[PDB]
Amino acid sequence: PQIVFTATALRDLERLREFLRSKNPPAAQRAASAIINTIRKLESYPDIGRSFRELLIDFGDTGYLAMYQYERLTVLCIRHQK
Amino acid sequence: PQIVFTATALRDLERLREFPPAAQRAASAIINTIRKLESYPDISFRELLIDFGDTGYLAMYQLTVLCIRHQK
Amino acid sequence: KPVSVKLDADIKARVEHLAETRKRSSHWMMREAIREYVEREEKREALQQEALRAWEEHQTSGLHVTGDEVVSW
Amino acid sequence: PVSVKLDADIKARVEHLAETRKRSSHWMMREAIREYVEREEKREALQQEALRAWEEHQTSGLHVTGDEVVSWLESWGSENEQAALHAT
Numbered sequence: 001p002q003i004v005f006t007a008t009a010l011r012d013l014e015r016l017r018e019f020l021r022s023k024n025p026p027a028a029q030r031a032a033s034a035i036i037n038t039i040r041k042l043e044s045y046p047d048i049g050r051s052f053r054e055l056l057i058d059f060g061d062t063g064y065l066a067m068y069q070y071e072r073l074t075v076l077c078i079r080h081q082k
Numbered sequence: 083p084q085i086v087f088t089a090t091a092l093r094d095l096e097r098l099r100e101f102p103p104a105a106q107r108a109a110s111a112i113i114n115t116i117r118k119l120e121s122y123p124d125i126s127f128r129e130l131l132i133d134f135g136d137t138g139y140l141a142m143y144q145l146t147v148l149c150i151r152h153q154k
Numbered sequence: 155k156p157v158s159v160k161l162d163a164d165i166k167a168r169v170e171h172l173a174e175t176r177k178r179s180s181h182w183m184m185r186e187a188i189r190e191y192v193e194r195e196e197k198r199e200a201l202q203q204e205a206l207r208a209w210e211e212h213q214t215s216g217l218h219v220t221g222d223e224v225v226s227w
Numbered sequence: 228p229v230s231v232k233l234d235a236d237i238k239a240r241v242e243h244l245a246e247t248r249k250r251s252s253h254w255m256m257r258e259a260i261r262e263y264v265e266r267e268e269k270r271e272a273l274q275q276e277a278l279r280a281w282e283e284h285q286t287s288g289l290h291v292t293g294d295e296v297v298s299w300l301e302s303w304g305s306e307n308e309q310a311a312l313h314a315t
Contacts, residue, residue, distance in 0.1 A: 003293030008280035010291055010311050017303065024133065028304035036300055039293045061133055067277045075290065077280040080273055086219035090208035092227070116221060129205065142205045148219070149208035152201065155238065159256055161228035168264045175271060184232050184260050191259030192240050199248055 002073030003042055009066075012079040016064070027060045034059035038066060046074050056082075085120050088149040091141070095151065098139070108134050112141070119146050232256070289315045 005013075013035075020028040038057045048055045052069035057079075068076040098108070111134035124130060129142020129150070141151040161169075173180045218224035234241070245252035284290065291314060302308045 004290045005293065005296055006280050006284040006290060007287070007313070008283065010296065013296065026304055032300035032303035036297050039297050043293065060137060069281060075281070075284060077284060078277040084219065085221060086217060088208050088212045088217060090211060144209070147212060149212065150205040156231050156233035157238070158229060158231040159253065161230060163228050165261060165264060166228055168268065169260060172264060172267055172271060181232065185234065187260045187263035188232070188234055188241065188256055189237055190263060191255070192237060192244055195244060196240060199244065
């Protein structure tokens, strides 16, 4: 698949970034790796969750929630803070 | 406060220790936690937070008697 | 084993609305709401007892602490 | 109001729990539904804003690739960071 993010998922990432600043000391680089892991594990075994499903991304303090769809480019829509 | 520690919290640390810079890493996160308790004890007792690196631990306490610090 | 529960009205309205959406029953609705409550409080009030047992072991014996300087261990 | 629910063994774990923390079994059960419906209404909200987010992507058609945000993310916290672009 193509692993595509939506505009809503990009700006959920932006909120996210601009947050960590006042969040974990260096978990900015810790959250980033967790997503890229989640991004490239979607590039392979694309599945999990609950007709599209969800996916949790765990890192340090707590975790977030990726939501995505599908049949050749799992569009990634929305990643709120759970 | 005197910042006391219990035996159940003492062995929860020895459990911890066993588990690469870490020997001097997570120890610093607790001494910070220890000394911010000597001033700000937060606030029915509340077991405080603890976060460094991979994940975070859980030091419950109530002198501030520190009883049990499990891995969360 | 059935048992009656008086509902706050207004919620029951929020209960029955989510049942319309999910296409499930108002009975199975709460049937989970009870499980997920105890399924959580059973663990939380399980670690409450752990820390509470530590208080029992201290309130009857000695201890040490100061700061990275033990005393009466 | 006043409608009845029926559980199985779970009610025993309730009545037992409604005795440890010495609270009313009838009260406890109610808090369960409120917490539930509160959490669950917020899940129904995330659904739509997720569902909507899509509807917008299907209409607008613009997106960014995982690699671009993989490219963006690997510079997080390392002073010279990056932004995100918007391809069509």
